[PDB]
Amino acid sequence: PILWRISAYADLSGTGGLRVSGRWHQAGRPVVYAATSPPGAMLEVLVHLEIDPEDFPTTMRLLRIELPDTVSQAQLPALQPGWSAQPELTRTLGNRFLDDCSALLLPVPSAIMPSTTNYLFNPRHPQAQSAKIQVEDFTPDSRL
Amino acid sequence: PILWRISAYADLSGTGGLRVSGRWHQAGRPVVYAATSPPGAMLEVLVHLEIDPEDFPTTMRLLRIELPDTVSQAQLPALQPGWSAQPELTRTLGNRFLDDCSALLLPVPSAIMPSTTNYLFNPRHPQAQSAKIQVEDFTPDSRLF
Amino acid sequence: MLAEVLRDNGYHEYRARLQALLDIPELASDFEIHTRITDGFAATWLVKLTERGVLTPVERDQIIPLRTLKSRIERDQPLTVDESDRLFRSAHITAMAEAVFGEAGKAKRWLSKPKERFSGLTPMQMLTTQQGTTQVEEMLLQIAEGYGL
Amino acid sequence: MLAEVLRDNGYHEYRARLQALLDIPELASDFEIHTRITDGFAATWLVKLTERGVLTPVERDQIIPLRTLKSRIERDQPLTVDESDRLFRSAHITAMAEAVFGEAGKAKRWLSKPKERFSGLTPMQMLTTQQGTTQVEEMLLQIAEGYGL
Amino acid sequence: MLAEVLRDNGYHEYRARLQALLDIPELASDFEIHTRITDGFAATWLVKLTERGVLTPVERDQIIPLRTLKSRIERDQPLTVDESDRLFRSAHITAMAEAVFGEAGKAKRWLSKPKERFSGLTPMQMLTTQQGTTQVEEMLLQIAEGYGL
Amino acid sequence: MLAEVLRDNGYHEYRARLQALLDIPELASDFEIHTRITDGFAATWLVKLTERGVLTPVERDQIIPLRTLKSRIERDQPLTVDESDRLFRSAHITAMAEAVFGEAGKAKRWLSKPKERFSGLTPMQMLTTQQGTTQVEEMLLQIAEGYG
DNA sequence: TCCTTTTCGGCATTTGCCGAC
DNA sequence: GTCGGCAAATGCCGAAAAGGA
């Protein structure tokens, strides 16, 4: 299907995970956080990074990622209530998905919206070469 | 085809459109605004209605709307740049779609995010009964407010 | 018309909040409301409202100047029709916001925060004119109906 | 804009009538209208309106007493926010009734004569409050839609 | 290192902003930066920074009390290692924020606004400890890398 | 947050040692660490760290002068935010080095040995600036990458 | 050589009155 | 009315030589 990323970089290297941690990973692994919708990614970034729309960075880029439907994705274990406040658990699960190198994608639930699914993208997986990326520019009719 | 709405009511009547207008319609017609993704609807509401998460209404509800594949859609004309600041034009096109009653759904672009498509829903089309609605609750692992 | 838009319990809750805030019966007709406004509200009600933290001092001054209010209360005078209409505007907007938002803190907060739709003015500051009050009403109904596109 | 956008093609006619009554452009935004009200309307416009036959001296003094009007015209200060707001309410329902009835004469006759709904009060008097203004607007809307009984 | 994650483009941006803010050449090595901090900084530079609106007076006080800085400038003494380190933390967080956000205004606003992650503290208030500065860096890099979930 | 770059169990070992060095709970948040630094650490803990040989007397003097320390102890005052900041820097680098080398002895020796990259300065001397602390962390991570 | 003990010199900055916006 | 600054004596910081292992 189609995934959406919001980041200063227009690649899928995800090298910042080698020295920066997140909710779904510990520093030292390359990783890319993506969403299923541009509003999804934008809302996640605005809420969790605490950015006001008047302070939205001008270096930020929206990247559309297209993958074939044959790609491999790993299933996340069932999550009991409280996981949104247990970063150790989510970081451990993401680290296990990344180091096992079993699949290219990991669907995870959103912590701010129900029925919303974000995705973990492992660039070290060999299927990360079939990704086609293009930047979708923010137009004056697409402001915040 | 699944649509997502955020409103204080758990129906598809849209009667409030008979008194208050939006970006895509003028008052006097019933209409339902919806998004293709719950974060889409949430971002639209929060940005255009200027609601901080600490003031998010308790009355608000998130509705999943399931429609059959035979549902009818309309096509919006080619918009020229700058339409996000021309509410009269958007209201004109939405009023035209709602009055012609030619289709149930109208795909419209978003004024917030590129490549994002919101939807107008006409509750007076004969296909509005085929809609199945359900409320998605806000759990503390799926909340921002 | 309002009771047609405010569905479920919105209108009932709005009338209950008006009864609490302005001693206006829930079953009173709109003409009864207009007559009550023309008859004049007591200044004691206004000072009780600002004491209980319903209105801020700047909002009370928007309703009526402090010197004029003290004159009215020490003369055992009801408020004038324009002062009563300003206070009614405040109470109406507060009750409508509490009906749409579902609780008191969220409503008053949203009413007390600047908006880019108002060029950085708060909805309570928009309550100086008929037009600003109707704009606040329109925003509240857009919130209730989900017109966020 | 609360209850004046409910007519087919009547909204632009209402805005044109309002532009004739007050210097308020057809394309001016609602926040611009609020700032025009808060900037203060000129009393010269008010005396010109009551001269041109759209406001009677009693309807003029309902907006501002004659003494205060002389004070404004002499000392050269525009109408206060409350006086300008009353003038705007007057011009607003006048433009609305003109858009509804299609002519100024029948609109003025309807606005100036008492109506039973209001227990023997003219719609121009109902402009003393937010509620009475809304009632006049609802009545005009019912007339415009072709409602029966 | 910081450049590895910071993308030589953005890293050059950060070094340019740091040179403009603290007169540290953009080609100096990290040990050179450490030495410049240990050698001390001129109080003249701090008063120029606060006069150019780069640092708020309360931020200047967080770096060093005013009377102490006056003693420094009178004695023509360089800043102590801890004062110079506070100054470097301030300017370095400012440079990284300007490199990530692309504009100085947005960066300073984001640094001056309270954060729920910091229990209602601004990032500039986090610069009193090594761990707080590190948390601010982590947040900036999370913004830059798109770790928004 | 370069301590998080440590592999497998490193960070956990880093938090255990840091808990033994400065009584910082292993699952405490980074903001809680900031709060502990701002509230000030007990000077008695610093004196005990010197007594147990965790710090050398010159290292303690660099953290806080001795007269000032005795004043803190008598007046029953926690350490200031910058004295506590230097103490935290010392304990943090010590715990990181102990997690990299796996033993207090080698770690303390490597921390007290001058380095060419630092113009003949020891890593413990590099803990006077944010940049020097970052350089020490980077060197520790370089060592841990190519284990040595 | 390495480190401590205390002396008051001397640095540092509160604290309240008084200016700028 | 808020935010910011100025300067005196209370108060803090720690230097420095002399002493101890």
Author numbering:
A (entry chain A): 1 to 144
B (entry chain D): 1 to 145
C (entry chain E), D (entry chain F), E (entry chain B): 1 to 149
F (entry chain C): 1 to 148
Original paper wording:
In the widespread xre-res system, the encoded Xre (Xenobiotic response element) protein contains a putative HTH DNA-binding domain that is stabilised in a higher-order structure through interaction with the associated RES-domain protein. The two proteins are expressed from two-gene operons that have been classified as toxin-antitoxin (TA) systems, which are widely distributed cellular regulators in bacteria that encode a protein toxin that inhibits cell growth along with a cognate protein antitoxin that neutralises it. The crystal structure of a Xre-RES complex from Pseudomonas putida revealed an unusual 4:2 TA stoichiometry in which each of the RES domains of a central toxin dimer interacts with a dimer of Xre antitoxins, thus generating two complete HTH domains. The HTH domain of this Xre antitoxin (XrePp) is structurally similar to the bacteriophage lambda Cro repressor and could thus potentially play a part in transcriptional regulation and toxin control through binding of the antitoxin to the TA promoter region, as observed for many TA systems. The RES toxin has an ADP-ribosyltransferase fold and expression of an orthologue from the insect pathogen, Photorhabdus luminescens, has been shown to result in efficient depletion of intracellular NAD+ in E. coli, suggesting that the RES toxin is a NAD+ glycohydrolase (NADase).
To get a molecular understanding of the interaction between Xre-RESPp and promoter DNA, we determined the crystal structure of the Xre-RESPp complex bound to a 30 bp dsDNA oligo covering the S4 element to 2.7 Å (R/ Rfree = 22.8%/ 26.9%). The structure contains four complete heterohexameric (4:2) Xre-RESPp complexes and four DNA duplexes in the crystallographic asymmetric unit. In all molecules, one Xre dimer of each Xre-RESPp complex interacts strongly with two adjacent major grooves on dsDNA. The interaction between the Xre dimer and DNA causes the major groove on the opposing side of the double helix to expand from 11.8 Å in canonical B-DNA to 14 Å. Significantly, we observe that the Xre dimer is asymmetrical in the way it interacts with DNA and overall approaches the double helix in a different way than classical HTH domains such as the Cro-repressor. More specifically, the angle between the helical axis of DNA and that of the recognition helix of the outer Xre molecule is 61.4° while it is 57.5° for the inner Xre molecule. Several residues in Xre, in particular Arg60, Arg67, Thr68, Lys70, and Arg72, interact tightly with C13, C20, and G21 on the (+) strand, as well as T7, T8, T9, and A14 on the (-) strand of S4 DNA. The dominant interactions are centred around the conserved Arg67 of the innermost Xre, which engages in hydrogen bonds to the N3 atom of T9 of the DNA (-) strand. Interestingly, Arg67 of the outermost Xre displaces A14 of the (+) strand and forms hydrogen bonds to the N3 of C13 (+).
